Design a protein around this ligand. Structure first.
Ligand SMILES: [Mg+2]
Ligand SMILES: [Mg+2]
Lengths: 248, 255
């Protein structure tokens, strides 16, 4: 049976109405890269039974987003006014990350979802990576089209002995970079999977997780079938989801 | 849920629309539909992306206990019922059509409870061989069912015309009164009623505004109005969502 893979929604006001939204490129990556059947998880927080939710899925994709985790979740400084937040999503995903990993449900986090994984286990974020002084500007260039904004823009150094090494990624490869926030303090119990050239942690796995649990700061859903390094990540996630699906 | 109940919670799929937002294509669903599934039907909503038959709809349906076909500002493309070309500027969502029209039929053949609202009611009619009027207000004896777009949501989604229940069907069976007022946020409507569909209710101008699928093995109801709007405060809207939820719970009990 094909794995049912949950995909986290964002919230968005569209005209007069509130919506729950999920990007097509994530959904198509789940179908084409992971071999799964995607269903979108609305950002309803613990308004609903997350244990019943987890029972019905074979894996979870925590997507990227223009929005940012609220800093209160890591006791960080208040955000600059106008920073984009999605408290409904935060209320959904931070407990969901912890619960899924405890249940042995495969997890892949992309960009915001990677940041969610670090915060959910007690880590913190830099809200303006480009201003810390130690890091490059990891944001996508404004005033450029999508194909430029999502193209590879910096190197990625795989740390040996973990998930990315096990999947067979090269020791250094290029990744896109569409993020203003990033890991500050690494949560306890997380393994560093990869570093950008300025030392920014851009991939993590969860030590002692019973099942696949990987987050990456870049956006590997982008034209996934045509980037072998991105496709390998989705294929590895899909195989984990299929293993869970096959134990039903 | 009810005090002391241990019944399995139904997983209810909710249809997405497609929309470009900022630089990217998205699949979207209105919060009011999702909250009505939780509060009115007692289910756990998951959104079904508008991926058409690029995925295995039968395998998707195996994992859900019910389906809500939502309303939308967009309109079914008229090719699906051999209709006249739409006026230029008409909003369509062809990726949604490619998902929902086959999904309606597959769901009913699999015994998955179906509730269609507004566009979803129209989809039910088209999927079984009926047709639509693209501008109801220009046709026959029909009146203007469209919402006043210069007004706040509270006015737009308040009850604006009567609804006359036709005896002997689902709506009478769940105990709705013979006449009640409904909201009206639609410019299209039923023209040819699909074969095998029961007329459940009529607007005062004769427009068919509710149908049920005769011979369906499970709950299969569509309504042209928008009962998800403040569903708990309107007893007629709530009765519809409760009946849907009970059917979804019956299927969940079979897992
Ligand atoms: Mg980067
Ligand atoms: Mg009407």
């Amino acid at each position: 049976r094909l794995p049912l893979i949950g995909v986290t929604a964002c919230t968005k006001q569209i005209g007069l109405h509130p919506y729950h939204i999920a990007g097509d490129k994530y959904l198509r990556a789940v179908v084409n890269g992971a071999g799964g059947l995607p269903l979108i998880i609305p950002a309803l927080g613990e308004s609903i039974d997350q244990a019943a939710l987890l029972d019905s899925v074979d894996g979870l994709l925590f997507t990227g987003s223009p929005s940012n985790v609220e800093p209160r979740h890591y006791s960080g400084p208040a955000s600059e006014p106008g920073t984009l937040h999605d408290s409904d999503r935060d209320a959904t995903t931070l407990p969901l990350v912890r619960a899924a990993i405890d249940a042995g449900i495969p997890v892949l986090g992309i960009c915001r979802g990677f940041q969610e994984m670090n915060v959910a286990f007690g880590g913190s974020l830099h809200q303006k990576v480009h201003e810390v002084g130690t890091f490059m500007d990891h944001r996508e260039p404004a005033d450029q089209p999508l194909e430029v904004q999502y193209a590879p823009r910096h190197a990625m150094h795989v740390q040996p002995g973990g998930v990315l090494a096990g999947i067979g990624l090269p020791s250094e490869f290029q990744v896109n970079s569409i993020h203003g926030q990033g890991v500050d303090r690494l949560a306890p119990g997380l393994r560093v999977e990869a570093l950008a050239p300025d030392g920014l942690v851009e991939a993590i796995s969860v030590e002692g997780a019973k099942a696949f649990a990987l987050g990456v700061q870049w956006n590997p859903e982008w034209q996934v079938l045509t980037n072998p390094n991105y496709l390998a990540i989705f294929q590895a996630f899909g195989k984990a989801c299929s293993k869970r699906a096959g134990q039903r």
